[PDB]
Amino acid sequence: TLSILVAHDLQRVIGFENQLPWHLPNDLKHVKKLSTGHTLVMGRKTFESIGKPLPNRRNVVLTSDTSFNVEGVDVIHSIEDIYQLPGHVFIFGGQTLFEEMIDKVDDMYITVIEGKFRGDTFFPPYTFEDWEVASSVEGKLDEKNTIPHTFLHLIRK
Ligand SMILES: NC(=O)C1=CN2[C@@H]3O[C@H](COP(=O)(O)OP(=O)(O)OC[C@H]4O[C@@H](n5cnc6c(N)ncnc65)[C@H](OP(=O)(O)O)[C@@H]4O)[C@@H](O)[C@H]3O[C@@H]2CC1
Ligand SMILES: CCc1nc(N)nc(N)c1C#CCc1cc(-c2ccc(C(=O)O)cc2)ccc1OC
């Protein structure tokens, strides 16, 4: 199974200056639940912004740098290498990789952040004419999660 895994705001912002524009612990847990024991694929910039590989899953970084070699990280140099990865593979970021993969993936796990943030990186446009809503779950607000958000599982028609 090949999935997209992304959080974007009302205008499809996913990032600002190498970081996430919002602080939302429930979504990180959502990411952890979904991807633990599976595979995350990410472009080089996304990985460097994270800093280190995420625990308890395969971390695959796509780059053209043939010197790239980080411990805990597997490296691929072609989009085409993605299709060779076994198991449940999540396309994790960033804008460049989302643009390359959105027409190829089976489904998308989107967290819609219900706000308008300043961004410099965006999720590509997509229409619900192409995607069935398998589920839509409102996130709970609290002490530490103060921005409305909705977990979507979209499946290609
Ligand atoms: N929530 C997110 O997903 C976030 C992502 N990070 C943002 O990516 C922002 C803008 O740059 P972007 O091009 O979107 O970076 P992504 O694709 O991770 O990674 C780009 C790199 O992936 C690699 N790449 C993507 N496609 C290919 C490819 N087809 N072949 C070889 N390398 C690939 C190539 O890396 P390289 O310069 O070291 O060779 C490319 O420049 C960049 O500002 C990062 O900050 C955000 C923080 C939030
Ligand atoms: C975690 C935000 C997020 N949510 C969803 N639904 N899909 C995604 N693809 C990303 C993402 C991302 C990139 C990113 C992840 C993280 C991150 C940090 C910690 C954990 C964790 O503790 O599980 C997960 C992701 C941190 C920074 C960062 O870019 C700056």
Side-chain angles (χ1 to χ4, degrees), residues 14-26:
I14 60 169
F16 186 64
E17 286 177 340
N18 290 350
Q19 298 299 326
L20 300 168
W22 44 79
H23 308 275
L24 200 54
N26 288 347

Side-chain angles (χ1 to χ4, degrees), residues 68-137:
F68 196 92
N69 169 277
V70 181
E71 189 217 5
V73 172
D74 306 341
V75 188
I76 62 173
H77 298 295
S78 175
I79 276 297
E80 308 295 320
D81 294 311
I82 292 174
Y83 308 114
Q84 296 300 314
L85 302 169
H88 198 170
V89 170
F90 300 88
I91 306 300
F92 191 65
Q95 167 174 333
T96 297
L97 192 59
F98 287 141
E99 287 171 354
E100 299 177 272
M101 293 309 292
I102 189 163
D103 288 323
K104 313 286 172 188
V105 296
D106 303 318
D107 61 344
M108 309 193 291
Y109 295 85
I110 302 184
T111 306
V112 179
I113 315 292
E114 321 270 3
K116 288 170 175 174
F117 291 76
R118 167 173 304 103
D120 54 28
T121 37
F122 287 76
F123 193 77
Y126 60 94
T127 168
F128 286 102
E129 299 165 20
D130 299 344
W131 300 92
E132 190 180 1
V133 181
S135 61
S136 175
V137 178

Side-chain angles (χ1 to χ4, degrees), residues 43-81:
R44 188 258 307 169
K45 292 181 180 187
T46 292
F47 170 68
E48 306 272 58
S49 80
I50 296 179
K52 261 145 182 52
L54 304 183
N56 306 131
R57 67 215 87 165
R58 189 179 185 187
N59 293 245
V60 176
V61 173
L62 174 62
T63 171
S64 65
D65 185 357
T66 63
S67 290
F68 196 92
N69 169 277
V70 181
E71 189 217 5
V73 172
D74 306 341
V75 188
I76 62 173
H77 298 295
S78 175
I79 276 297
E80 308 295 320
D81 294 311

Side-chain angles (χ1 to χ4, degrees), residues 22-27 140-147 149:
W22 44 79
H23 308 275
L24 200 54
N26 288 347
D27 188 52
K140 315 272 204 191
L141 298 196
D142 59 35
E143 40 265 2
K144 311 176 176 294
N145 303 266
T146 62
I147 315 155
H149 51 288

